[PDB]
């Protein structure tokens, strides 16, 4: 049977291949592959701590292979994987920019090629995948609303008041009380019941 969905998936697949190819083997004038620290997972044996917090470090050379197998299908998941390796790079390697300037350069050429490939995506996917040319590295829409400060309360309580103990959504940078959400104030990368609702299967019949 004919499916536009499988045509779109395979279309973008070989096309992602183009873009990710430029990034994987992106070289400076001295012929250095800047994406090297991201394209290869590190020796697992001497990194329990690393993989404890970063339980999903990811690997570009593997993402590449996963592109051709048509696992991502659309750009949604594709763009996720790329922005993931860059962000965890900047996260644990150092303060905030360790290899940052190196992989952010890749990221810049990534968005450039993203912008480039937006042509075909337009003809294939359309506008349901939007443009995704809003810069940044964290979120794409960023705002996606009206307000979203660091000091803003957002709990199911509805009080909008900074009382008791509460943690911060890594993406919203909003405050949610620990007792309500079922937290232990131990979360390093907590996400809210919106961005990524974490399901806790506590002995549910």
């Amino acid at each position: 049977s004919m499916n536009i969905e499988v045509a779109r998936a395979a279309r973008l697949a070989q096309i992602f291949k183009e873009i990710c190819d430029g990034i994987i083997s992106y070289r400076d004038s001295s012929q250095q592959t800047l994406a090297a620290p991201l394209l290869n997972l590190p020796p697992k044996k001497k990194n329990a701590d690393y993989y404890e917090k970063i339980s999903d470090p990811l690997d570009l050379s593997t993402i590449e292979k996963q592109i051709l197998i048509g696992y991502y299908k659309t750009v949604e998941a594709f763009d996720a994987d790329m922005l993931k390796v860059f962000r965890n790079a900047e996260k644990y390697y150092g303060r905030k920019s360790p290899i940052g300037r190196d992989v952010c350069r890749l990221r810049k050429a990534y968005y450039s090629a993203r912008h480039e490939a937006s042509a075909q995506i337009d003809e294939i996917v359309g506008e349901t995948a939007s443009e995704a040319d809003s810069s940044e590295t964290s979120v794409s829409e960023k705002e996606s609303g009206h307000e979203k400060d660091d000091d803003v309360i957002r709990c199911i309580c509805g009080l909008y008041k900074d009382e008791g103990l509460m943690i911060q959504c890594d993406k919203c940078m909003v405050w949610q009380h620990c007792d309500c959400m079922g937290v232990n104030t131990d979360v390093e990368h907590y996400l809210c019941e919106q961005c990524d609702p974490r399901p806790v299967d506590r002995e549910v019949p």
């Binding site: 008041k161 943690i167 959504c169 890594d170």
Partner: peptide, 12 residues
């Protein structure tokens, strides 16, 4: 992730 423990945290 930052953790608030009552908005006021005056220590002295």
């Amino acid at each position: 992730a930052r953790t608030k423990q009552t908005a006021r945290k005056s220590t002295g």
